[PDB]
Ligand binder design. Structure first.
Ligand SMILES: *[C@@H]1O[C@H](CO)[C@@H](O)[C@H](O)[C@H]1NC(C)=O
Length: 380
């Protein structure tokens, strides 16, 4: 390829601070905006290798039929491999009433319906991601429609299986004009465990124009290294060690690294940066130390440097507040959410400069010089 041989491992890696977005595994420095495409491809391979498992490509069979009852469409999808194995699933779409825009409705793919308010001119697709890969506990490993296609021992984590499903949904929408969706204006959202999922979807599926993870916490927009710092200093956060025993959001291989995080040549600031140069705003809640609040702020601050280096800082937002229940939406943040939806899904001239925290981090502080070691280059 134009990126040469993509690295999927870095055996000698050992860095207690955040991995540098702007240096390839081979030591080459990023210099151009085009370099970011290759670096993102390498980050994708590293994340798959160390924590996410293998993301399969589009299978040889993908078919879709559509029917509509009232304002509810049903998109019946079939996916199949060359060995004849197939699975089927049928997300529903809730439409705004009346005549759609020329190019169809903008759409947000909402994991299990999401927990954000979706404005009136945007359609909502409800993605039953738990059916694609189960997520009750460690007991759920290898269970779900995805594994009925690829096998229950396939390395994909549940979140990687969910991403695969989103990619098939977008495949189906592109081949189904009667769904009346503008496939150039698709967003994705989810809250809590499904916010972890939504971030993975936006990172790995480049056809998503806007990514909105809501209270995703550890394994979402928090960084593993920063959460280890938090837990060592007395905040009762979720961390890498606990999360792999709690559920199946990560590959089994990640168990080999959760006690050796400095040897992992990525962290979730690079996961989030895989969305660049597309748009993302994530929302966090400081009321629950489980979500690892300092870790999310520092992690997204580090991710933000990639957008800054690409000259598109305002395509990446972060808003972190307290004072509300988990996955309840505070009206105080509706303007920030709507700014990103209006700009990136509704083609309005909305400004999207949102990068705010209350710094309510408990027993630690954020010290950027202790975690971010790189200067930000102006990619050309
Ligand atoms: C370093 O790796 C990147 C990513 O594969 C590649 O684009 C670049 O050309 C490599 N450097 C050299 C000197 O081959």
């Amino acid at each position: 390829g134009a990126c040469g041989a993509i690295a999927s491992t870095v055996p000698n890696y050992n860095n207690a601070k955040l991995p540098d977005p702007f240096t390839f595994a081979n030591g080459t420095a990023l210099r151009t905006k085009a370099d970011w495409s290759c670096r993102r491809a390498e980050i994708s391979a590293l994340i798959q290798n160390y924590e996410a498992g293998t993301l399969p490509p589009k299978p040889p069979v993908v078919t879709a039929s559509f029917s509509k009852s009232g304002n509810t469409g049903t998109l019946a999808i079939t996916a199949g491999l060359s060995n004849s194995q197939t699975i089927k699933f049928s997300p529903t779409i809730s439409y705004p009433s009346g005549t759609p825009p020329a190019n169809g409705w903008p759409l947000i793919i909402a994991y299990e319906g999401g927990s954000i308010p979706i404005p009136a001119g945007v359609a909502t697709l409800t993605y039953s991601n738990s059916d694609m890969a189960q997520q009750n506990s460690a007991s759920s490993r290898g269970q779900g429609l995805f594994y009925q296609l690829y096998g229950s021992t396939h390395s994909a984590s549940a979140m990687t299986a969910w991403v695969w499903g989103v990619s098939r949904i977008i495949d189906a929408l592109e081949m189904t004009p009667t769904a009346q969706i503008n496939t150039q204006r698709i967003g994705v959202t989810g809250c809590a465990r499904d916010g972890k999922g939504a971030l993975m979807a936006g990172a790995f599926e480049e056809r998503i124009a806007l990514t909105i993870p809501q209270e995703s916490g550890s394994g979402g927009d928090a960084c593993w290294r920063l959460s280890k710092y938090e837990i060592d200093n007395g905040n009762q956060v979720q961390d890498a060690v606990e999360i792999v025993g709690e559920n199946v959001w990560f590959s089994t291989n990640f168990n080999n690294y959760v006690q050796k995080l400095p040897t992992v040549p990525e962290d979730h600031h690079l996961l989030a940066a895989m969305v660049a140069p597309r748009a993302m705003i994530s929302f966090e809640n400081t009321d629950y130390l489980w979500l690892s609040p300092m870790s999310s702020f520092g992690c997204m601050t580090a991710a933000h440097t990639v957008w800054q280096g690409l000259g598109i800082a305002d395509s990446h937002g972060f808003a972190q507040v307290g004072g509300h229940a988990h996955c309840a939406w505070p009206s105080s943040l509706t303007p920030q959410l709507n700014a990103f939806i209006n700009r990136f899904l509704l083609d309005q001239s909305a400004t999207t400069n949102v990068f705010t925290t209350n710094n309510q981090f408990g027993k630690v502080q954020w010290n950027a010089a202790n975690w971010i070691t790189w200067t930000t280059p102006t990619l050309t």
